[PDB]
Amino acid sequence: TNLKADPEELFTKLEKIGKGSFGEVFKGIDNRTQKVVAIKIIDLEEAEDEIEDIQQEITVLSQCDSPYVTKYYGSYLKDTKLWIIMEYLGGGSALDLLEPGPLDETQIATILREILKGLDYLHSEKKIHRDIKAANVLLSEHGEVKLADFGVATPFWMAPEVIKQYDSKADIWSLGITAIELARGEPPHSELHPMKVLFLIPKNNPPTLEGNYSKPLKEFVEACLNKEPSFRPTAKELLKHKFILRNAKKTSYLTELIDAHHHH
Ligand SMILES: CNc1ncc2cc(-c3ccc(-c4nc(C)ccc4F)cc3Cl)c(=O)n(C[C@H]3OC[C@H](N)CO3)c2n1
C-alpha cells in the first residue's frame, strides 16, 4: 500500500463505472502520464469485516504479471478511504457486450480462448480465479480480453464441490457456465431464487447448452460441466478443443462487438 502520497493529487477522478466489490469504482486520469485508470474507493470505516478479503485480492493481483489479467498499479490510504488503482479497460465487460444481441460462435470461441489463456496462466502459477463469469471478463478498446474481480478465498456460476466444500478444476466448471452465458445470455437457472439454485447445482445433472448451436460448442460445454472434477479437462487441453481451434479468430475482430455496443 502507500500511506505517504495523496491519491487525489496523483489522480483525477471522473465518472463512476458502476459499483463493485466493497466500494464504488471510477474512471480516472493518472495526472503524470494522463493514461486512463480505474479507481476503486473503499470506505474502511464502513467495511470492518471485509478488510482481510480486500488485502487478499490486493496480494493476488500484485503477484500477477500477464496480458490476460487486469494490471494492478497500487493502493493508497487517504483519511478513511482506500484508493485502489488498476488499468482502465475501455471495451467494457463481456456481459455488457451481450446487450445488443446474440454473439456468434466465432465471438464466443474468441472470448473463451482468451479466458482459457488467463486460466492457464493463473493455474500454472498455482492460483484459482474463483469467480469466472462474463461480468468479470473485461475487454480493452482494441479487443484484448482480461480477467478481473477475483473471488474471495450469487451461486449460478459455482461448481458443485464449491457449494458442498476444491482446486483449479472449479474454474473449469465456471468456464462452462460462462460458455452457456455467452451463447444464451444468462447462466442456467437464472430465473430461480438463488437459495433454490444452491441445492439445485449439487442435486441435478450438469447443465447442457440448449438450442441451435454447433456440436463442438455443445461438447465444449459438456466437457467443462462434469460433476466429477477430475473428468474436467485442464485449460491447456481446452485451448486445443476443436470448438476453439475451428472457430476462434484474432481478438482485434472483437472491436466490431465493442462498436456495436456503442451504437446500441
Ligand atoms: C469497464 N472497465 C474497467 N476497467 C477496469 C476495472 C477495474 C476494476 C477493479 C476491480 C477490482 C479491484 C480490486 N478490488 C479489491 C477489493 C482489491 C484489489 C483490487 F485491485 C480494483 C479495480 Cl479498479 C473495476 O471494478 N472495474 C469495473 C468492474 O468491472 C467488472 C465488473 N464485474 C464490475 O465493475 C473496471 N472496469
* DSSP three-state, residue 251: helix
83 lines ligand 1 (CB under 6 A): no
Name residue 75's amino acid.
S
* 93 and 124 belong to one structural domain: yes
Helix (H/G/I), strand (E/B), else coil: 238? helix
How far is 203 from 68, CA to CA, in rounded Å? 34
Whether residues 191 and 130 share a domain: the answer is yes
Q: Which of 1, 16, 136, 138 to mutate to test the pocket of ligand 1 (most atoms within 8 A of CB)?
A: 138
Which atom of ligand 1 is nearest the CA belonging to 42? Answer: 16
Residue 137 DSSP symbol: E
Residues 169 and 95 in one domain: yes
For residue 23, which of 44, 37, 8, 49 has the smallest C-alpha distance?
Answer: 44
Atom from ligand 1 closest to the CA of residue 88: 4
- Resolution for the entry shown, Å: 2.1
Is the C-beta atom of 140 inside 6 A of ligand 1?
no
Q: CA separation (Å) from 202 to 84, 205, 254?
A: 36, 8, 35
What's the DSSP call for residue 186? S
**Count of domains forming the chain:** 2
Contacts of 127 (CB under 8 A, 6+ apart): 60, 63, 64
Q: What are phi and psi of 86, to 5 degrees?
A: -130, 170
Taking the CA of residue 22 as reference, the ligand 1 atom at the shortest distance is 16
Q: Is the CB of 135 under 6 A from ligand 1?
A: yes
Residues 189 and 162 in one domain: yes
CA distance to 48, 120, 184, 213, 245, per residue, from 218 (Å): 44, 22, 12, 7, 15
78, 99: one domain: no
Which residue ranges make up the annotated binding site for Mg(2+)?
136, 149
Q: CA torsion, points 225, 231, 235, 241, in degrees to nearest 10?
A: -80
Say whether both 68 and 117 belong to one domain: no
Cα-based torsion angle of the residue sequence 216, 222, 228, 229 in order, rounded to the nearest 10 degrees: 60
Q: How many CB atoms neighbour CB 78 within 10 A? A: 15
Closest protein CA for atom 18 of ligand 1: 58
Give nearest CA residue, ligand 1 atom 16: 54
In this structure, what C-alpha cell is assigned to residue 88? 482502465
**Method used experimentally:** X-ray
67 lies in the same domain as 110? no
DSSP characters for 71-95? -EEEEEEETTEEEEEEE--TTEETT
Supply the range of the domain harboring residue 9. Answer: 1-88
For a pocket test of ligand 1, which of 57, 68, 70, 97 has the largest count of ligand atoms closer than 8 A to its C-beta? 70
**Are residues 212 and 99 located together in one domain of the fold?**
yes
Question: Catalytic amino acids?
Answer: 131
What are the binding residues?
A: 17-25, 40, 87-89, 136, 149
